[PDB]
Structures are given as C-alpha cells and as structure tokens.
Design a protein around this nucleic acid. Structure first.
Ligand SMILES: [Mg+2]
Ligand SMILES: [Mg+2]
Ligand SMILES: [Mg+2]
Ligand SMILES: [Mg+2]
Ligand SMILES: [Mg+2]
Ligand SMILES: [Mg+2]
Ligand SMILES: [Mg+2]
Ligand SMILES: [Mg+2]
Ligand SMILES: [Mg+2]
Ligand SMILES: [Mg+2]
Ligand SMILES: [Zn+2]
Lengths: 211, 108, 287, 159, 148, 285, 152
RNA sequence: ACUGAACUCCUCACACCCAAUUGGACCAAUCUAUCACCCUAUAGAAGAACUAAUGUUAGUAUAAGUAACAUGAAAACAUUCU
C-alpha cells in the first residue's frame, strides 16, 4: 500500500476489524516534526528566558563553539559509521536523513579551518529548545561505493560550505543535538556527479500516446 | 519392465544437459521501428497489436451500441470517425461510428 | 619517413585531445532530451565535453548501440563517438530508417576513409603514395572513390586481380581489427600542423576551413591514420561486412600527374546482400 | 532455509587507489519460492549465462516456457537495483555472470504423496561487457599441447 | 594409499650436506600444564631432560610455555617454515625424548610419499642414451635406399 | 542474424532482381547451345568395352504404350530438363579405378545455394543444377565440362538402368516395411528386420527398355517403373546387365550433338515394335 | 503416410471440423477480423475466399444461396455477404483475406493468427513493411537498374 | 642357460594372515566420584559403538520431468453459433 487510508479501506473490504485498544504507555518522543519557525535567511530573548528557566547555566556566547563540536564530531562519526555516538550527537529526526542513504558506501568527510566564526542566528521554544546557527566552513568529501570507487567529490580539495544548522534540546538528561539543516532557496547547486543519469519518460501502455 | 539399477547423476547429467535438450538461442529478434519494443521477425509486434486490439475493442463496443441486439448486421459498409471530422463525400451511404478520442497517428 | 609521419601525426593528434579535455570546467553536466520517435521524452543528464551519443545509446539499451549509427543532434548529423557540447536533442539514425540519407552518406565517407587507410600502408617503401582526397560520390552512383597520386615509377602501373584482392584482404584485416573512428574538430592551424607534408590535403584543409565562420576542420583517426572528412563517420570499422576494392581508374586530364582514382563498394552488417546480388554490385562498381 | 545470496549485496569494499583499475559491480539478486521446478528452470537459467542483460531479456521474451517471464521479472528488477542502488551508470552495460536455480521448500499433497514443487532463481549480474566466448581450439593449439606433452616426459623408474 | 595422498621427490632444504650441515629445526614450543595428569610426562621432561636437550643443540630455541593446557603439545618449527604440531599427551619421559629427538633429527619436508629413493642432479656422466648412441654411421651420411 | 536474399529489398527492387537473375539464367543456358562451335575435346569412336555418360531426368509420370503384338507396356516418361556436364576428373586425380564425370540437372535458384557452390557454377558459367550425380566413365567418352546433354543421348531399343530415391513412407513397422507378422542367442543379430524408416533411399531398377524418345520436348519413354515419386530426379545410365554389354555400336558415343548438324533427328524416335499413334489400327493377320 | 493429404484433421470428426471452420468463417464474416489459432485460421482461409467466390455469383443464384445458407450460421450475415463483401471485392479476383501471426496465446502457448478481410473499416494491422527504397542496398540496386536501362 | 613366489637369503623391524569356538591386551562416547579447565586423568558404572534384519521413522534420489491429467468456438466477454 501507500498510506493508512488504503490499508483501512482494504481492511474494511476484507473484514479485518482492528480494534483501537487503550494502552497506558505511549511513545516518548524526543524530537520534533521539523522546525518551529522556518528561519528564512537573507528579539527572541523571550525564548532565551524560556530556556534559562529550565537550564539555568547556559551562555549563548559559548554556544556556537559548542555547536561547532556537536557538528564536526557528528560528521566524523560518519567516517567510521559509529551510530551509537550519533544518537548522543544528533536528533532522531536527523539521524535517518544523514545515515540512511550513506549506508553500504564509505564516506570520508573531513573538516578544515573555518572561514568565518560560527555564530548563532535565532532561538525558539514537553519543551523543545531550538537554536539555528550559521556556519561558514571548509570541508572535504569523498563518497565511495560498495565497490570503493569514487562517486562524489575530490578527497583533498576543500570546499566552502554554508550551514544553517538547527539544533534542538529536550527541556532532564538531553543535550543540544543537530535537529535539521536549513538549505535556503537561493543556494547554488551542489557539486556535480561523476556519473551520468538517464531519466525515463512516461511508460506508455498501448492505449495511450506521447504528446 | 522395471529398471534393473538406478541411473546415476553422471548418466543423467549427460542426458538432460546435452544440446538436444537445451534451449536454442534464437535470432529472429528485432526492434519494432514504430514502438521500439523488440519484436520477432515474421510475427507482428505484441505491443502494436495490443494498440490495434484495444481500438478494435472500443470500436466494436460502439458497433454494438448502435446496432442494438443480435441479428443486426447492416447491408452497408461502415466508417469509423473521430472527434472533429466531417464524413467525406466518399463516406456517404455508410454507417458512422463516432468516437470520443483523437484520430490516431496510425489509423488512416 | 613514413613511421615518423604516423608517429608525429598521432602525437599532434594527442596534443590536441590533451588540450581538448583540459579545458573542462570540471564536469559540467548538460542535459539532452531524447527527441525521438520511440522511447520518447527521456533526458540524459550527461558530462559536458566527455560523454558522446554512444553513451546516451548505452543508457537506453544494447539495441540502440548496435543499431544506431549517426545522431541527429539538433537536426545535425553527429558521430557516435564525438563528445557532446551543450544541452541539445538527440535522434539516433540507423540504416533501416524511413529516409536514411545522412546515414548512407556517412557510411560512404567512412568506407572511402578506410580505403585510404588500406592504400597508404599497401605499397612497398620505395614508392611514394599520396592521397589527395575522397570526393563525395552519390550512393546511387555505384562506388565510393578515393583519388590517389602515385609515384613516377608507377606512372604506367595497373594492378592485376590479385593486387585488388590483396587490397581487399588488407581491408578485411582492417575491419577485423574493430577500430573506432576518433574525431576531432580542430582549428586550421593545428590541422595544417598535422598534414604539413602533403600539398593536396593542405589545400583541402584550406578550402574547408574557408567554409565555416571559425577555422574549424574535422579530423578522423581509424588507427594510426589521420584524414580529413567532409562530415560525420560510422562509429566502427566493424560495421562494414562486405567490402571490396573493385577497380582502379586513371583520370584523363592529367598533364601534371595522374589523379588515379580507386573504386570500391561495401555493405554493412545490417544491409547484407546475397552473393549473386553482391556480384552484380561488384560489376556496376567498375565504371 | 538459508538466505546467503541476499546478503551478498551488502559487502562493502574499502575504497580504491588512483593507481588501480576500476572494480566492476556485482549485483546479487534472487527470487524464492517460484512455483516451478528446479530442473525446468535449469534450461532457462542455463540459456542466459554469459549474455548481456539485453540479450537475455530479448531471448526470454519469446520463449514459451513459464519460467521465462519470471526470470524476466528478476532481471528487470535487478537492472533497476543495478542502477538505483549499486551505482551502475549504464543500464545496458551488464551481463549475467551467474544464473542458477535451487530447489525451494516444496509442499506435499496427499492424494499417494505428490509434491508441489518450488524453486528459487539466483542471478549475479556483473557490470561490464559480456566476456568473449571461448574460441574452439585450433590445430595449432592441439599440436602445441601434444608436443608439450612430448617435451614433458621423462625416463621413468630410473635415476 | 599413494593415489589419494600427494607425493614428492626426495630433496634437501638448501643442499644440506654439501657445504656444511645445518640443523633444520628452529623452534620447539612445549606447553605443559602445571596441575594436570596428561602433562605429567611433560613435566618430568622439563625437569629432567629439556636442559640437556637444549645444550646438545644450541641452534634450537626452545619455549616452554606452561599454561593450563588440557592436552600438552610440542610445536616444532623448521627453517623452511614448516610446522609440525605433535602431542606429548599421556606419554612417558622416554617416549617424549624419542619424539623430541625424532623432531630434531628430521627436516621440514613433508612426510608425504617420496617417489624415488634417490635424487641425483647429474645422473649421467658418460652422456645419457639417445637412439643414435650405439649406432654406426654411414659414408656421407646416407640413409637406406639413398642412391647418391 | 541470418538473412535471406529478399529481406532488405524494397517493393521496387524485388521483381527487378527476379527479372535480372532469371534473364542471366536464360542467357547462360542459351550460351552453351553450341558445344562444337566452341572448342570441345577430341571425339573418339566407340571401342568395345567403353562407357559413356548418363543423364538426370525428371519423372513425368506413366502412360501406356501398345506394341505390335497387342500388349500393354506401362511406360514412365522422363524429361531431361537442363542437363549439363559439370566437372571431369581423370582417374589419376580420382584415385578410383575409372574416370568420372559430374553431371547435374534442373536449374535451381541462385538465392538458395551455399557460396562454394555458387562460386563453382560462377566459374563454370552456369545456373546451378539441383542434383549432381557422378558417372564412372572411360577416357574415350569425356565431353568438356559445360555441355548440354540431351534426350537423344539414348536411343530406342537401348536398355537402361535408372536409379533414384524411392518414395519415403516414414517410420513404418514390420508388416508394411518387411512384410511379415533365438532364446540361446542372447542378442539380436545385425540386419534384423525391425520397424524403422521405410523408403527415402536410393534404389536402382536394372535393365529397362527405352521405347520411344521425344527429341522436341526431350522426353525418354522407358519400360516399367522407376523409383521415385513424380517430378523426382533420376540418374539414367546405360545398363550394366551382362546380356547388354556390347550394344554401344549404334549409340552416339561421347553424347548426341545437335550442334554437329549431321542427319538431324525427327520429333520422336520410336522402337520398331511400338505401335505409333497415327498408324492405322493394327491387325494381327 | 500422408502424401498429398491437403486437409487438416480437426475437431472430433470430419463433420466437426466443418462445423469448427464454419464457426470461424461466420465469426470473420461478422467481425471482419479474427484472432484464432493458426492451423484453424489457414484451413478457414481456404474456405473463406471460396465463399466470396460464391458471393460474387449473385444473390439471385440458387446454388450460392444454398452455400451461404450452410456456411453462415447467423442468417443476418447472408445479406452482408451478398451486399457488402461481394460488392467490395468485385474488382480483384483473389486474395480477399490477409493472414498474419499474433504472438502466442498466453493460455496454452498456441501458434496464433489473424485473418482479416482486406479493406475493412477496422483499425489497420501493423503490417510487415518492405524496407525503404532509400536505404543503401536499395539505392545501389536502383543505380544498377539505371545502368541496365542505359543499355538501350 | 634365463625367467619365475608371500619359499629362502639380504638391510632394518618383528606380538602383527584361519571357520565356529576360546584366552588376552587396549579402548570411542556418555554419566558418577575426585582432578582438570581450549577437552583431560584414575576409578566406578551403563539404554556403552551398526556397511546388512523384504528392519522402523524421517529426508532426498532413481525410473522421470516419464505415465497420466485438463478448457466446444468467435466476440463487444454483453452475446451468438455448433
Ligand atoms: Mg486433436
Ligand atoms: Mg625374483
Ligand atoms: Mg582417550
Ligand atoms: Mg573412563
Ligand atoms: Mg545399544
Ligand atoms: Mg554385517
Ligand atoms: Mg536397515
Ligand atoms: Mg510435458
Ligand atoms: Mg522411458
Ligand atoms: Mg502421454
Ligand atoms: Zn511494435
């Protein structure tokens, strides 16, 4: 199937009555479906108070330093495929979106010195703190294959990366972890690919035509 | 009678793997120029004949709607017409089966 | 020296490919819509000055590699191994098309060039062989031709049947090698650098570089053999199935030297003829 | 039940070096519990064992047998995951290196025991042009083999 | 049987008697349990005989490992990189001494079948027989039915 | 792929190639009509003990033929259609006991032969024949390869061996094939009569009288029955039967030559005992 | 041994083969195009063209109306055979049907065939075309025809 | 005269070619006692050892992809016809 309506209509046509049963335990989520306020890039001390009243030892003047080490160390966990550290470093909205398509291929990301200082942009808020940070770095990539042949990026050459990384904290034992990464609509296209792609047209059954 | 001994897999492999039992690589196979799905020579394309089969299916359904009931074979030749086509001067005195789609590129 | 000729010509050729690929903007990726009758509306997202129409055919199937011969790139005939240049539209032209004029012409140009690759490496060393051109013969006219000027020793030479048969045996040795036809569109200065020791082909490069608004001239290479064509060529030598060098004629208004034309006829692996039909096509190719 | 052939698409090789030839891709695909017998799939599996996948598809579209359609679904599916999942750039540039068929978990129907026969179908596709077929050995090869056997021989059972 | 086993030709390691003789046994590795009834005869071999043995051939380096084993082993390694692992399980000291001297005396070559009982490398001195030894020649090299 | 000759030709070029190749077959058959105005091989007279060429003929069917004693004789007709001598091999190159002539009949399409055969007939200058049979023959009878053989190579009164492939009946069992239906021998002897494929093999009818030859349509009218279905090709040689080993005195010895133009033959030669049509109705008085 | 046996043995008798062929011929006079298995189609092709040659003998002919009364199991098609099909083919003397092969039947893998009657209103079949006259071989042979016409 | 054995000699080693029967020395695996601790030791015990019972159960072969088996026809799948 493709959705829940297709399964419930198929379960009604079949006769599968699935009773919605009452259970006292639910799912204890630690993330958010996306971003609270979509920071569209080129006064939120409200939410800084609404963070410090829970955390009470929190200096924003030290945080994009910390946001650097949450960023970079998480990306080095892709070089080894260490998922158990990534769950401390990254949120669960962010973990599949960075580790799923990279499965069964080796990546060799590396960091080199930033062009700009990283600096925090905005802060928003059972309670989910959410901090977007601007990072302007120089990174290196080489995404290989199952067969160890290069499919993205020269390994030595550093490239300049803009990164509007959104962090999130649960507000008891949690910390700041990468939640998402905003890419602005004005951004240039990424590196081109080493291979070529055929993109199929409409598969025509005999009764229809191409127009 | 009954088998005296049991045939072995050496004898059997020599029997069921010799080329009289293998499938011949056939080489009649071309590409239909009009559809690009590969056909076989001396045989019509499965795809293009499925086109023609489906359009004869709609046309025969509308034959059956304009006749109505069995034993209504007309004494008149018939002409299939598509949307936005006047019956020609040659089409006079011929029953007309109006369609709802465009004239195909291959019907003429 | 002839070995110095082929070495220095191929080395100038590889200087031009080496300069030709070095001017990439690091894998720019242009897309070409397969404007074609069948399998329509499929874009190929390809590397810019690297990937040829053969690789588009390889994205479609083995059938469109083995059967397709030219490519109408924006209505222009294109080699299968000539690298693409920009976002365009590709048809694939085969021999068995509805109106295959440009494919007959491309096959014809190819077979004349293969013939010249047989002629240059045919004679023993003390005889100067000099290839002036391949004139554009219509396919109706019976036989592809190649004008050659021979040495003054062979002013009165006329080959036997066994010598034309030895020319064909060198041609089937040239088909069996299965050689692709490399192309290079080169401006006229390096084109005059490669052919700097033949007056006839120099004048041909000069007359053809006068025809385009640049100084652009097509060069083709079979294997170790460079020549100037008028347009596109066949993808491989392996397409020619039947190939016969059928006759030699001497042109008449020859006061300075003999413009000694060679005749030949050939058919692809696709348009094979029966042996009797092929004999009658041999006879008509000797006029 | 063993399922080792599905896992074979999960081998990850350490990345290569620039002074090293490009490793061709290997796409292990299979279908399990095909309702057909394992020895009728041997002819269809045997038929396509070094062919390119376009020649294999083309040969299986015009074969009359039941398994030809099933193998054609397996090869179109493995051409898809060849390109999507395993970084094969050209759909056309594959060939069948392995195409076998094992027996599946059969059923037994009491009539008088009668087996409902099942099978699998295992295909490894390898990226690249299909390898050139083995030429029949000539009289030069036979004469050199014979003479090399004559050169090989020693005075036996002595010093 | 001989057709199931591999065979080899009789050889040496580096022409082992020609210039000088070299002891082909590099390392012995005894592993002897401290408390354990199977390595009793190994224990009394380390206590009595292994120092005398280690002095009777100093080109052999001997490692007594003395871990908790449940079967004691001796592992002979040879100069050509062969390894013979034999057990000294439930053996007397005298049987272990004849085994260790057996491993000392031999070489690393396999105890697969040896084809010939000898190995000359120059078997022929007067020239090996070819079918034109022991035939007389003719005048001017003629053959039968040769006229001139 | 394999092709055939017709595959890549347009609608315009199929009857053009039919008329072209058919007209060169008629021209090549027409150019060989003067063997003696050509340069033949030296013609020798008949010597006692020499053999001459046979023929290859179509079997047209049967018809009756009444003799002067009022008895039927069932007679096969055998048309000679485009028979020609194809290659002469002497006894030295044959390593047989006798020289051989290869003779073929019934022009067959050029678009349906192996190319070694088409090169053979191309060098020979002829359209290709269906069958090539080989005749054991003395040196005295050796016509040049490329010459027509005619019906009047045989004459009435001559006895003739005719061989051809019999009508194949397919796999038949014992009762039809052989006509019927040990313990210590533990096996079935070779040559045991069992079911199997009946017919479709060469048999030879020996000693058949030639009754009438028709020079215009080139028909031979032979006594009795000939192996083979209708329109089958038979190999028609003079008989080896030892009661008929000396009657080559009156037969034209290399072959019959209409090109020789000497005392030309009528429409139809008859044997002396044949009641001809057109003769008055026979009376036994 | 079946030399010269021209008729397929079909159905479950000679009567039943003539009723199978009569049903196929009735289907093709009604619909003017039929998919049917191949041996049944060419047997019926021989019967179909002869049936038009009885259709050209006139409606008023008594023997033609006997044959059409037998061979057309649906009686409304007897006005169609004498006023639609037989006036259509009044010019040409033979070749009223065309037969082609379908790909094989998916059920039992039978050799399948179509016959249609020529010149019908239905969508045309993808007929196997001759190769174009502008190809390489066809232009060489066209030029050879031009030379052999230049001989006169 | 030569060949020719498991006889006899020769170099080293020797307890190391019979049925039924009968004497003896060892012993696989298991459990118990106490050791041992990458698989053992001394004993004590016993459902204590399988190339064979038209053995029993299960698996999978062979005969064999064999014998056998199945759907009147066209079609608009409505319907009509045999
Ligand atoms: Mg039947
Ligand atoms: Mg002896
Ligand atoms: Mg033990
Ligand atoms: Mg015990
Ligand atoms: Mg027991
Ligand atoms: Mg027993
Ligand atoms: Mg048992
Ligand atoms: Mg069957
Ligand atoms: Mg049997
Ligand atoms: Mg049966
Ligand atoms: Zn098609």
């Amino acid at each position: 199937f493709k959705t829940e309506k297709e399964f419930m209509q198929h379960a009604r046509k079949a006769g599968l009555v699935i009773p919605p049963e009452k259970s006292d335990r639910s799912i204890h989520l630690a993330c958010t479906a996306g971003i609270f306020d979509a920071y569209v890039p080129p006064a939120s001390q409200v939410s800084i108070r609404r963070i410090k009243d829970y955390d009470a030892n929190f200096k924003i003047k030290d945080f994009p330093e910390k946001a650097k080490d949450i960023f970079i160390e998480a990306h080095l966990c892709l070089n080894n495929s260490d998922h158990d550290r990534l769950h401390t470093l990254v949120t669960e909205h962010c973990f599949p979106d960075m580790t799923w398509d990279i499965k069964y291929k080796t990546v060799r990301w590396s960091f080199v010195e930033s062009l700009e200082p990283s600096h925090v942009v905005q802060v928003r808020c059972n309670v989910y703190g959410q901090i977007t940070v601007r990072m302007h770095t120089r990174q290196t990539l080489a995404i290989y294959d199952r067969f160890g042949r290069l499919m993205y990026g020269q390994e030595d050459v550093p490239k300049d990366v803009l990164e509007y990384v959104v962090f999130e904290k649960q507000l008891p034992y949690g910390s700041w972890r990468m939640h998402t990464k905003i890419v602005p609509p004005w951004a240039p296209p990424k590196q081109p690919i080493l291979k070529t792609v055929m993109i199929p047209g409409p598969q025509l059954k005999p009764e229809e035509e191409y127009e | 009678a009954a088998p005296k001994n049991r045939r072995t897999i050496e004898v059997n492999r020599c029997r069921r793997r010799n080329p009289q039992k293998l499938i011949k690589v056939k080489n009649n196979i071309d590409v239909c120029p009009e559809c690009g799905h590969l056909k076989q020579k001396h045989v019509l394309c499965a795809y293009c004949y499925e086109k023609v089969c489906k359009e004869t299916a709609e046309i025969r359904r509308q034959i059956g709607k304009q006749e109505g009931g069995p034993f209504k074979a007309p004494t008149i030749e018939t002409v299939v017409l598509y949307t936005g086509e006047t019956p020609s001067e040659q089409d006079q005195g011929k029953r007309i089966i109006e369609r709802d789609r465009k004239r195909p590129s291959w019907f003429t | 020296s002839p070995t110095e000729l082929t070495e220095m010509r191929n080395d100038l050729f590889n200087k031009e490919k080496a300069r030709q690929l070095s001017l990439t903007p690091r894998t720019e990726k242009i897309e070409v819509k397969h404007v074609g009758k069948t399998d329509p509306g499929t874009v190929f997202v390809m590397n810019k000055n690297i990937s040829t129409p053969y690789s588009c055919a390889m994205h479609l199937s083995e059938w469109y590699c083995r059967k397709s011969i030219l490519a109408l790139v924006d209505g222009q005939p294109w080699d299968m191994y000539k690298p693409l240049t920009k976002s365009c539209e590709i048809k694939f032209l085969t021999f068995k098309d509805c109106d295959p004029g440009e494919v007959n012409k491309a096959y014809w140009r190819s077979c004349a060039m293969m013939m010249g690759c047989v002629i240059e490496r045919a004679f023993k060393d003390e005889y100067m062989v000099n290839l002036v051109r391949a004139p554009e013969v219509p396919v109706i006219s019976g036989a592809f031709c190649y004008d050659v000027v021979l040495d003054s020793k062979l002013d009165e030479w006329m080959p036997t049947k066994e010598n034309l048969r030895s020319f064909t045996k060198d041609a089937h040795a040239l088909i069996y090698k299965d050689l692709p036809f490399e192309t290079l569109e080169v401006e006229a200065k390096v084109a005059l650098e490669i052919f700097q020791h033949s007056k006839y082909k120099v004048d041909f490069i000069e007359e053809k570089a006068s025809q385009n608004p640049e100084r652009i001239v097509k060069l083709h290479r079979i294997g170790d053999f460079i020549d100037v064509s008028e347009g596109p060529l066949i993808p491989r030598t392996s397409i020619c199935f039947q190939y016969e060098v059928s006759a030699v004629h001497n042109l008449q208004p020859t006061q300075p030297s003999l413009i000694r034309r060679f005749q030949g006829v050939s058919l692809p692996v696709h348009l094979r003829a029966h042996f009797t039909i092929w004999d009658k096509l041999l006879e008509r190719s000797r006029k | 039940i063993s399922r080792k052939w599905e896992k074979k698409n999960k081998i990850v090789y350490p990345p290569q070096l620039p002074g090293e030839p490009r490793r061709p891709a290997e796409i292990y695909h299979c279908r399990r519990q095909i309702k057909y017998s394992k020895d009728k799939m041997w002819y269809l599996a045997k038929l396509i064992r070094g062919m390119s996948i376009d020649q294999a598809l083309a040969q299986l579209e015009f074969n009359d047998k039941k398994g030809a359609k099933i193998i054609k679904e397996v090869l179109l599916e493995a051409q898809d995951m060849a390109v999507r999942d395993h970084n094969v750039e050209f759909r056309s540039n594959l060939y069948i290196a392995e195409s076998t068929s094992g027996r599946g978990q059969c059923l037994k129907r009491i009539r008088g025991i009668m087996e409902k026969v099942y099978c699998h179908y295992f295909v490894k596709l390898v990226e690249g042009p299909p390898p050139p077929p083995e030429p029949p050995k000539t009289a030069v090869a036979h004469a050199k083999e014979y003479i090399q056997q004559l050169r090989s021989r020693t005075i036996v059972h002595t010093l | 049987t001989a057709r199931g086993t591999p065979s080899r030709f009789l050889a040496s390691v580096l022409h082992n008697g020609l210039g000088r003789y070299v002891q082909q046994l590099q390392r012995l590795s005894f592993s002897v349990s401290r408390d354990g009834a199977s390595s009793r005869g190994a224990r009394e071999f380390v206590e009595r005989e292994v120092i005398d043995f280690a002095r009777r051939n100093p080109g052999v380096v001997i490692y007594v490992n003395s871990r908790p084993c449940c079967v004691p082993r001796v592992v002979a390694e040879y100069l050509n990189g062969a390894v013979r692992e034999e057990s000294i399980h439930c053996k007397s000291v005298e049987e272990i001494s004849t085994l260790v001297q057996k491993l000392a005396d031999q070489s690393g070559l396999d105890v697969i079948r040896i084809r010939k009982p000898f190995h000359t490398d120059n078997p022929s001195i007067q020239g090996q027989w070819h079918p034109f030894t022991n035939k007389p020649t003719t005048f001017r090299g003629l053959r039968p039915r040769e006229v001139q | 792929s394999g092709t055939w000759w017709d595959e890549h030709l347009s609608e315009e070029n199929v009857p053009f190639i039919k008329q072209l190749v058919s007209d060169e077959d008629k021209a090549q058959l027409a150019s060989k009509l003067c063997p003696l105005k050509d340069e033949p091989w030296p013609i020798h007279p008949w010597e006692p003990g020499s053999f001459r060429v046979g023929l290859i003929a179509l079997k047209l069917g049967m018809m009756p033929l009444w003799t002067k004693d009022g008895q039927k004789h069932v007679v096969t007709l055998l048309q000679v259609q485009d028979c020609h001598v194809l290659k002469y091999t002497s006894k030295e190159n044959c390593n047989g006991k006798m020289a051989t002539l290869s003779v073929g009949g019934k022009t067959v399409s050029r678009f349906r032969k192996a190319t070694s055969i088409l090169e053979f007939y191309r060098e020979l200058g002829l359209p290709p024949k269906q069958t090539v049979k080989i005749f054991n023959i003395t040196d005295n009878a050796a016509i040049k390869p490329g010459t027509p053989l005619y019906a009047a190579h045989f004459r009435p009164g001559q006895y003739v061996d005719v061989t051809a492939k019999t009508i194949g009946k397919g796999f038949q069992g014992v009762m039809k094939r052989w006509g019927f239906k040990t313990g210590d021998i533990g096996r079935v002897w070779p040559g045991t009569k069992m079911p199997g494929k009946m017919g479709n093999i060469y048999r030879t009818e020996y000693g058949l009288k030639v009754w009438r030859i028709n020079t215009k349509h080139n028909i031979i009218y032979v006594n009795g029955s000939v192996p083979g279905h209708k329109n089958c090709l038979v190999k028609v040689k003079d008989s080896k039967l030892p009661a008929y080993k000396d009657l080559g005195k009156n037969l034209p010895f290399p072959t019959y030559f209409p090109d020789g133009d000497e005392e030309e033959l009528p429409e139809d030669l008859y044997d002396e005992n044949v009641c001809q049509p057109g003769a008055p109705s026979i009376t036994f008085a | 041994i079946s030399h010269g046996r021209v008729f397929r043995r079909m159905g479950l008798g000679p009567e039943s083969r003539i009723h199978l062929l009569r049903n196929l011929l009735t289907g093709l006079v009604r619909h003017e195009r039929i998919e049917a298995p191949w041996a049944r189609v060419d047997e019926m092709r021989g019967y179909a063209e002869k049936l038009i040659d009885y259709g050209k003998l006139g409606d008023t002919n008594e023997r033609a109306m006997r044959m059409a009364d037998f061979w057309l199991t649906e009686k409304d098609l007897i006005p169609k055979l004498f006023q639609v099909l037989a006036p259509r083919y009044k010019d040409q003397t033979g070749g009223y049907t065309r037969m082609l092969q379908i790909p094989n039947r998916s059920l039992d893998r039978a050799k399948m065939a179509v016959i249609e009657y020529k010149g019908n209103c239905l969508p045309p079949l993808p007929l196997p075309r001759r190769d174009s006259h502008l190809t390489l071989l066809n232009q060489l042979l066209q030029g050879l025809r031009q030379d052999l016409r230049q001989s006169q």
